[PDB]
Amino acid sequence: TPTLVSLLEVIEPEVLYAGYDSSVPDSTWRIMTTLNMLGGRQMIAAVKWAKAIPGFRNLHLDDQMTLLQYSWMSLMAFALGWRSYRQSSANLLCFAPDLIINEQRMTLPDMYDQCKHMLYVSSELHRLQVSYEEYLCMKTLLLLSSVPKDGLKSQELFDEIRMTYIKELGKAIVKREGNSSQNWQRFYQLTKLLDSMHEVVENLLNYCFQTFLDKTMSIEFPEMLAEIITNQIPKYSNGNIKKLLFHQ
């Protein structure tokens, strides 16, 4: 029988290129615009990815839509944090192979203030020496990290699936030879990182919601992102979000 983590591994999305011409000079506006277009393409691939996660298609269609709309930024920032920790350490954001935000790009007006929250993610994965298997389990768990205030249509089934991937994370932790005390603290550390994704995302969504709503900024979002932001803005203003936590 194929392991649950090996099924999460085969469905890992392909590498996307930004289509960024490096011969033309940089600007904050140019980088932000290119990142929005890349994000939209990443979110179309995330839908294909989510549908192949064992259990996800069994949830009501409305729940599938809900989970993807709440977690979009969490999934993207986490995947970016992972690429950035594997490809080139330490203070580099590896959005695409043709779009790495280096120290020279970080000096661009207000580039650092939006990048620092994402740099924290790669920094944490590096400090905790997160494995590929732990990462895969953690990423699926981020898709299941927020639910509506009054829960899902398939709430009981969701709770079963979420418990399954928590247990799957536990099995990946155990694979690193250590005693019960250090396994307990690893699970504690990793789930604390999962919890902190809510705060990392909060900062990214503020820039997101502002740039989307202020049309005088001429910051374009592709259809996929524009549709998610339009859906999400009222949900944040009406308190319609239950951020699931492992601690506190």
């Binding site: 179309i44 839908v47 294909k48 549908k51 269609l61 599938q64 839509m65 993807l68 709309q69 259809e223 996929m224 549709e227 998610i228 859906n231």
Partner: peptide, 13 residues
């Protein structure tokens, strides 16, 4: 409402 996401989930693949 949310036409593109619904399409991507409902379509084959």
């Amino acid at each position: 409402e949310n036409a593109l996401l619904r399409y991507l989930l409902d379509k084959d693949d």
